[PDB]
Amino acid sequence: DRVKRPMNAFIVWSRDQRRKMALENPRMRNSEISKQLGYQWKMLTEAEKWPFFQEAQKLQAMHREKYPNYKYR
DNA sequence: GCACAAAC
DNA sequence: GTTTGTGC
Question: A31 beta carbon < 7 A from strand C?
Fold first, then answer.
């Protein structure tokens, strides 16, 4: 039925990227961390891309082989 | 447009 | 309260 769902390259940033916002701003009242990341996307920091994108590639290649044309159902 | 995950 | 990527 449902296929598996490894973390998405977007939530990847959450894990580590949010650690940054939590260190200097562990007291965010409203939901700003949401629009803040959006700003990082229109300007992705390469210092952060290369590190986790390397493996992020094997995530797609491996699981895509286990579900050739099997899409969401 | 719908289905799935996480943290503040 | 909410965002975003993947797939057609």
Answer: yes
Handedness of CA A9, A48, A43, A37 (dihedral sign): positive
A50: its two tokens: 């290369």
Give the Å distances, CA to CA, from A38 to A5, A8, A14, A30.
22, 15, 12, 16
Q: Which of residues 15-34 of A touch strand B (CB under 7 A)?
A: 18, 22, 26, 28, 31, 33
Do A6 and A59 meet the contact criterion of CB atoms below 8 Å apart? yes
CATH topology of domain A1-73: DNA Binding (I), subunit A (1.10.30)
